[model samples]
Target: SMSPAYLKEILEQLLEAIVVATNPSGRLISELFQKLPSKVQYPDYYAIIKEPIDLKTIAQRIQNGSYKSIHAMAKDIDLLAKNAKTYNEPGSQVFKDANSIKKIFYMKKAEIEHHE
Candidate 1:
């Protein structure tokens, strides 16, 4: 079992990723698909319009009650960030933001679990 805070934190990361994934250019779209995890799923549009669409599915899954423990959520977030980094510039804002969120989420998760 997991706490509500765990679900909230994971959901927030998915939502943030959605914002960036949705608006990238077509080239970025191609790169994202190329870097996508074998487990990632969605339709066949390219990044031009596909990234956002796929990310929205990710978000909707969580919002619709697909909950995961903090560790599981962290794994998912890390995978998405890794894919972004594979195609984005070394210091891309989205990549950095994802890292930042990951760090914070872990720290908070640790703190919460430690106290329990």
Candidate 2:
């Protein structure tokens, strides 16, 4: 368990790590991950990723104290990575990007965490 302030401390670092992550497509991850895929353009996005989330929304959650534990926040991050990996095709640039994000996520998580 963690206070929201402490959670925010860790969350900020995680967010910091994400916004600069290299995107294989030459687009910045900061541009790519700020929001969920648009439903109109990606007609199947919501269906494919039933639990949609984005880095921008996670910031909202942190601000509102919506996460009850650090683990709760962690799950959302995990979901974001999974959503990215699932919605993009295998061997695609976004697929590689999502995999890279997952790698960064683990590294960032391990950096601030001790027992849980």
Candidate 3:
């Protein structure tokens, strides 16, 4: 992570593609992942998802100035998906969603780096 620079604007672009926009792709985002998972619904989730994250927190961090760089925010974004992959069954939709979005995330990194 580095200085802010164009990080805010870059962050908006990143969020819109996967988090904000309603994706049509079956394996993409769903209502389940837009916000933080309910602690009451899955009590054991907290045990394995050490750094639980969601899009709401990601967007909020921008205003609080926690994210030092676009890369820094990207790490949190990736962690959300990874956590799902690790905690859910491999054949489950949540796991597939995580796997699918991780691929989309990789493409996004490529675009940002090339534009950088």
Candidate 4:
């Protein structure tokens, strides 16, 4: 069991980290995929994303002629990552249960933290 204060702190930290890591004026699509822990690193449920898209695709989409809206793309990416939680691996009940209770939903990398 975790404390509420701890969870709130973690959430704040994660957001701060994203602000620091993400390009100040970059597309949200890139930020979305890039925000996740590296698939190569975590290689588990953390990378369990649906639609099987890559960061490069995200960047390209952001650069797309039709929808040059980074904020929209980023918002979608945020939903995709947060809502579609079990795409990385199926048939793993334990993993699902564990993932359900993760400390932070959209945590950025450590160095990305923008805390004062």
lDDT of each: 0.51, 0.77, 0.74, 0.41
Tens digit per residue, CA lDDT, model 3, 13-82: 7766776434556443645777876899987899888989876787788767788777787688689888
Better of 2 and 3 by TM-score: 2
Q: Any runs in candidate 1 off by more than 4 Å, and if so which?
A: 1-58
Worst 10 residues of 3 by lDDT: 19-28
Model 2: worst 10 consecutive residues (lDDT sum): 22-31
Candidate 2, 1-116: lDDT as tens digits: 56668878887787778778765656665566787877899889988888899888988987887877767877887788788888887887667666677678778888778545
TM-score leaderboard ranking: 2, 3, 1, 4
Each candidate's TM vs. the true structure? 0.48, 0.80, 0.80, 0.29
Question: To one decimal, what is the Cα RMSD in angstroms of model 2 from the true structure?
Answer: 2.9
The whole-model C-alpha lDDT of candidate 3 against the native structure comes to 0.74
Candidate 4 deviant stretches above 4 angstroms = 1-50, 89-116
Regions more than 4 Å wrong, model 3: 1-5, 20-30
Report residue 6 deviation for candidate 4 (angstroms).
Answer: 38
Across residues 1-116, which tens digit of lDDT does each residue of candidate 1 receive? 55777676656654454343423332222233323344345233233232332344455556766655555555665665565655456788656654654565566556656765
Clashing residue pairs for model 3:
none
Q: Mind giving the per-residue lDDT tens digits that candidate 4 earns over 1-108?
A: 435454444444443433344223442322334434566876764544444543344444534432333234445445544443455345444234223322222334
True lDDT of residue 26, candidate 2? 64
User: What is the Å distance of residue 111 in model 1 from its true position?
Assistant: 2.0
Q: How does model 2 score by TM-score?
A: 0.80
